[PDB]
Design a protein around this ligand. Sequence first.
Ligand SMILES: [Cl-]
Ligand SMILES: [Cl-]
Ligand SMILES: [Cl-]
Ligand SMILES: [Cl-]
Ligand SMILES: [Fe+3]
Ligand SMILES: [Fe+3]
Ligand SMILES: [Fe+3]
Ligand SMILES: [Fe+3]
Ligand SMILES: [Fe+3]
Ligand SMILES: [Fe+3]
Ligand SMILES: [Fe+3]
Ligand SMILES: [Fe+3]
Lengths: 178, 178, 178, 178
Amino acid sequence: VAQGPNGRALAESMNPDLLSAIQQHISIERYASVTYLAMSIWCAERELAGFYQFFDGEAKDEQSHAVHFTQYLIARSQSNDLQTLDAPRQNWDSLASLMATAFQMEADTTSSIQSVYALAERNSDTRTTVFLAPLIEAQIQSEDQFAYLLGRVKFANGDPTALLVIDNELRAGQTQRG
Amino acid sequence: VAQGPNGRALAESMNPDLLSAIQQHISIERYASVTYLAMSIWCAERELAGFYQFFDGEAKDEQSHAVHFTQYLIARSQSNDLQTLDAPRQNWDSLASLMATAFQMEADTTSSIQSVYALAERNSDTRTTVFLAPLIEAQIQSEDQFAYLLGRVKFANGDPTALLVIDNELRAGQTQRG
Amino acid sequence: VAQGPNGRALAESMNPDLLSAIQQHISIERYASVTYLAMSIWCAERELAGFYQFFDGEAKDEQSHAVHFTQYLIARSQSNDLQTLDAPRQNWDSLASLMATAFQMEADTTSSIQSVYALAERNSDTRTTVFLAPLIEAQIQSEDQFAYLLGRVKFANGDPTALLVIDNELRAGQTQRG
Amino acid sequence: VAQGPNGRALAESMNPDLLSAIQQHISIERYASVTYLAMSIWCAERELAGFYQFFDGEAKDEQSHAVHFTQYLIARSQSNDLQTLDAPRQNWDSLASLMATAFQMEADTTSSIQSVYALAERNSDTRTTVFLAPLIEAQIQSEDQFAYLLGRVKFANGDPTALLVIDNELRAGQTQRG
Ligand SMILES: [Cl-]
Ligand SMILES: [Cl-]
Ligand SMILES: [Cl-]
Ligand SMILES: [Cl-]
Ligand SMILES: [Fe+3]
Ligand SMILES: [Fe+3]
Ligand SMILES: [Fe+3]
Ligand SMILES: [Fe+3]
Ligand SMILES: [Fe+3]
Ligand SMILES: [Fe+3]
Ligand SMILES: [Fe+3]
Ligand SMILES: [Fe+3]
């Protein structure tokens, strides 16, 4: 039995380029987490308590997703490399602009997973493509959800009354089409 | 004992014109079903999740109504003839215009039942007039319901804020006067 | 953020050939649904009440599968295009011949999904291949189930007594190997 | 306030021809009851215990239907006239022949109600047409049920094994398509 780079027994070696791609994807999820924290704060500063609660939860969930990837590297006997985390964006001119950034961040998270998937496919690392499939499935639902929240906020057309109604929906947990 | 056209024992023969009228009415209900599916999709595309849920349910209910008619033909030992189904309308300029089409479709469904009823009356097929009576009763309630939804949406006068409030009513199941 | 063809925020563009393939596959599932309805009627006309109940349920389930695909297109910000639906086959000389058509229809449904899968793979649309995987898994179970029902009916060798016994199995919900 | 022929206060006079038609229809239902009793006995004599139990129940139900009509005449302040009851048929060469007689008797019961309905319509006695409508509705279900039992017995094609299986269905209460 051989030992992997993190010292555990090695079931199958992993290409270094794929390892680097997974490590950078963990950074993407960690950055999405702190971005959602920054969004939760922006919303709290404007008394949008439902949006604040929603994004506070999204920040915790994104961190959980990042940790899920760290556990996969442990399972593959690969080293983790927790990286420097950039400061998030913290200023937006409107809730609609913030929700646009949130949607783009969710789509960019999926793009990063897709890139890891394609590299695993090129390397015939089917443990990794199988591992990623349910995460891509979850990303489809998150993209559908964030397109719903963004589109509903844009429908409000900047009317505070409509934005208060949507804020109360989010506080109640009404956060997707259902 | 004689055998009916579908091969079962025949309680009483049915005029071929009335049979054709029932078969075409089944098509009307099947078409209403796919129209409500198209409406549910249009609403989902615009994040009107309550209207989407409402019309998704109406599509299933209209299909159930169609199947109820197929069972009546079986009970009368008559052949069914499931027909080609036209593509539904799929584009509307506004929720108010969609709800107008929905109301007209419900009224047109009743008109079709009324036409079958009148033909059964002319043929003294009292099994069929008796069978249709509770369906007409249900259509009165559906017309009242769709006049309520259409009128409430028109009252909103295209204001997104009012339409979000009504959307949330429908998501909660608040879909008639009560 | 860009807008997709159905107007929602677009996470990732979809090749038009793949969109057309998904739209036509929705038609395949809708056609399977109305075919199972026609089969349920054929069975009811011959007092095969268990087969009638089974196919009545299969018709509703196939429609649900079609709607599941419409929701995926909404999630991808793609337009749906609900198509004209052909009339189903409605005449069979025997239950064995009907079950053969049912099996072939289930296998043909899988073939259609496989074709969409292959096209998504060629386009590196991993959202779609991931989305389709559990549906293919479900199709394996449906093919196993319909091979079981067809084979059990063929084992009966046209004996009414054996067909009544199997009919009662289906009424009781005994519809697969288990 | 006027008094009706049975001595009670009279809400609305009834044409004597319609009264006679209702009184003779009560005889039709009473005769159906004793016919089902005779059928239950024929089945018991051949150890078809499920068919015996089914027809024993049908005899009681048909009597209840007859009494329901006697109550309507009381409600209309009309006299009842309980008539001589013919002896039922008691001999059949086969279960299939008995079930054919049973189906014809059910259809003949509906025909009798239809004839009363048509006469009430000609006399504009809308109390009576309204009273009869749910009874015609129930007759549609009974005709569907007896076409199912007759057709299933004919499918057996005289095989004792198949007839034992159907007999056990009836004992279990499995008496319609469901
Ligand atoms: Cl805004
Ligand atoms: Cl509107
Ligand atoms: Cl067969
Ligand atoms: Cl027989
Ligand atoms: Fe994530
Ligand atoms: Fe995310
Ligand atoms: Fe309807
Ligand atoms: Fe309707
Ligand atoms: Fe399917
Ligand atoms: Fe299928
Ligand atoms: Fe009766
Ligand atoms: Fe009867």
